[PDB]
Ligand binder design. Sequence first.
Ligand SMILES: Nc1ncnc2c1ncn2[C@@H]1O[C@H](COP(=O)(O)OP(=O)(O)O)[C@@H](O)[C@H]1O
Lengths: 33, 117, 128, 49, 49, 374
Amino acid sequence: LGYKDLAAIPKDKAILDIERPDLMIYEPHFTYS
Amino acid sequence: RSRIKALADEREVVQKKTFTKWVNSHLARVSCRITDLYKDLRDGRMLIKLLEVLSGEMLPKPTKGKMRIHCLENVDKALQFLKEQRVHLENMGSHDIVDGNHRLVLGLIWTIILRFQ
Amino acid sequence: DNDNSSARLFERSRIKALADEREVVQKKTFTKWVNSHLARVSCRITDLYKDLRDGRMLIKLLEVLSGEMLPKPTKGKMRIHCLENVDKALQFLKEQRVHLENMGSHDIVDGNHRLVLGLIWTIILRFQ
Amino acid sequence: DEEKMELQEIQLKEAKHIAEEADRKYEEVARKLVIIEGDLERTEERAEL
Amino acid sequence: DEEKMELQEIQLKEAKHIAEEADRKYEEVARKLVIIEGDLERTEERAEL
Amino acid sequence: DDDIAALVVDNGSGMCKAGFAGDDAPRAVFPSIVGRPRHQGVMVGMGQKDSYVGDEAQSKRGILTLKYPIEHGIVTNWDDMEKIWHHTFYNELRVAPEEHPVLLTEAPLNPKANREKMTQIMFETFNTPAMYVAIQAVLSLYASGRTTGIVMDSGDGVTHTVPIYEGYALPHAILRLDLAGRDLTDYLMKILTERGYSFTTTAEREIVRDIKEKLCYVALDFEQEMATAASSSSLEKSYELPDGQVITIGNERFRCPEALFQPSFLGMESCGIHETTFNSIMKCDVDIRKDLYANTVLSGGTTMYPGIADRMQKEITALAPSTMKIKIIAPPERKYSVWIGGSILASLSTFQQMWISKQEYDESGPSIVHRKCF
Ligand SMILES: Nc1ncnc2c1ncn2[C@@H]1O[C@H](COP(=O)(O)OP(=O)(O)O)[C@@H](O)[C@H]1O
């Protein structure tokens, strides 16, 4: 299967899509934005 | 609902499916299948048979019995055999496997995969 | 004080009016030229100063004019990703020996009018 | 034991409903927050210039 | 039956904590939203003037 | 991108964080504690564990002597650090380190042998292809979203301020102070003796730390708050121990973090964090201090107390000249800001040429890092 498929390495980078990382809130997540 | 544990859970469920599919192919040579990775490894007989299949040698036969202490000895035999073949393990004990810690048993399966690729 | 007041009035009237009036017309002609070349790849710019901040328009314009593939811009909306894109464009101009003075990534990113106009004029004069 | 157990079950499900309502309110307030400080950013810049 | 009862009791404990904590967070964030909204309003006033 | 995503590992004194590059949040966060049993072993037939590493050591604190491999930002014991790294790579991230470049963080001012040993261990044992060392405050500035400001980062072992103007750092203005969360924990454990509660062993240090994390705040005015707390009992909280007793923290809520601003409470003659930031600013040049006033960034978990930002702003504004504006910028997720900056750092295409290759390590040896990193 290869090493690429055995480990669930993320294909996409989530940090690129985001705006202004200082205004990020971790502890609630029930919404996409 | 924190991002940390959410990302952790999605990676764990993907790896839990993949490792079950991997162990079933090797365990199909004997007449054994693993329905669930966390629940079917608490007795330790399946781990003994999996290492017996992969290593090419036989292990000491497991102690009988449905007790907790018997399960602890059963998984300790497999862990001792893994320590025999120069395989390095950190923070891995019999009560960790028997109790059912998810990350530790997944790391155990991953370590066996990397040793016996 | 009166001599100094009248002198700096002469500055802020004549010097400022002449420079600002010239840059307005010069910007309009430049953006018309850029829209003329950018119709091939189906992109267009409304404002010269604002639209060049991201640096993707500059990369596409160099793709049009050179006719050859540049490195792909990084899909990032940060400040440093904008600096990265503008630096990629300026570096691509740098290998082909086009001379530039006082040109920096932050000069384009923060929106300096004279520097952006000078870069566009250099691209017009020395490339095509 | 049985007659206590059904009361335990009822209290569990109704507490779950209460928690869902709390999540409702907190999420919409967070939306309104983020919109507000964005507008405040823009206004503070305008006042400075 | 006794063991299933004890289980249900412990989930009831956990749910009560989760509901109370969510409500407290919602109250504080509502405070913060109102204050920032008022500051936004008079900043807009000053800039326009 | 055709290349394997790198691993970002942040190694503080208190907690270790780890994740993949390009992700907004780390995958593994766990305390960096190594435990060993101390009692007599009976019930033959059950498991044999030589040491407890990380979160499991926090679950069985009763029968363990808990040790911190990193203290004051310096790796005192290396076998424990290797155990922490092995548990991170194989049990938490489940990835082979030979397929991934790694990114590592450390304090600004520290011994050179720390960097050399870190590079030597992570090349020679884990067989990683490439690695890099970054400074945590620079990554905090990366994650803040701006390229100009002064960073004050205080972890569990060290506090440091660096100023950076338009991508240029000033090494003569970098300030380091050895006053962090562990000293606050010890001071709280000492001053809890007044009310009659005694905590001595290493297992109770985590209980005292939980009390500090849940029931502490920074007062705006210290003497007025002391008079208010001595007037009545309106500022009192109750915390229950794991065995059942309930203690009343009362007056100690705003006396533990006050040692951050007045180190003379701990017997040290150094200045507080506000005077350290101000002295670091005045060590810079004349032209850039106005921009450094407006872009003060707080980082690290120790700055997570309620009311720390308002007190810091009030302290700095009095010391600073009154003619301009002081802005303290405190992101809500400042606890993970270092790792977020590390993730952004490994996502740039320009950064891909700055890795220390295995060929370079074979050529120059472990001395390459001082030439290559920073
Ligand atoms: N919510 C909180 N409130 C107050 N203090 C906290 C909080 N969370 C953590 N801390 C303090 O911060 C320390 C953790 O800092 P951390 O950022 O992990 O340092 P490092 O990552 O450099 O080891 C802990 O020892 C604790 O004392």
